Design a protein around this ligand. Structure first.
Ligand code: BEF
Ligand code: BEF
Ligand code: BEF
Ligand code: BEF
Ligand code: MG
Length: 128
């Protein structure tokens, strides 16, 4: 995929945002911005130009599921890829996220190999 693709990494733990940013850097993606919850993410998305969102689930103010539903419902960004990356591992969470339009799902903790794979699967599926 295009190495200039612009990512938004959303997670309320700065520890986790840094981890994702660094793995993406390792894979060749340097165009990365950050948000600390769903409200903040929606503010940043309106700056335009974003091509991919990686989102946590548990966050204050607006959680990852609500963020996902908001993205899918808005004509400006309804086809934006959204990869969930979260501690929530239960079947019910995986099902709810998929039903709400998630592009993929990763359970923390995860390796760079898992991320590259999860990312690639989405790139192929969407023709990116
Ligand atoms: F995660 Be933020 F920096 F509070
Ligand atoms: F990165 Be966030 F905006 F604190
Ligand atoms: F807080 Be996240 F859902 F891992
Ligand atoms: F459960 Be399906 F999406 F109607
Ligand atoms: Mg969290």
């Amino acid at each position: 995929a295009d190495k200039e693709l612009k990512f938004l990494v959303v997670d309320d733990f700065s520890t986790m945002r840094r981890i994702v940013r660094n793995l993406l850097k390792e894979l060749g993606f340097n165009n990365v911005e950050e948000a600390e919850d769903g409200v903040d993410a929606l503010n940043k998305l309106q700056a335009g130009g974003y091509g991919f969102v990686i989102s946590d689930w548990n966050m204050p103010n607006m959680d990852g599921l609500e963020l996902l539903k908001t993205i899918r419902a808005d004509g400006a960004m309804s086809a934006l890829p959204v990869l969930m990356v979260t501690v929530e591992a239960k079947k019910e969470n995986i099902i709810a996220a998929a039903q709400a339009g998630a592009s993929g799902y990763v359970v923390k903790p995860f390796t760079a190999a898992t991320l590259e794979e999860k990312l690639n699967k989405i790139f192929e599926k969407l023709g990116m």
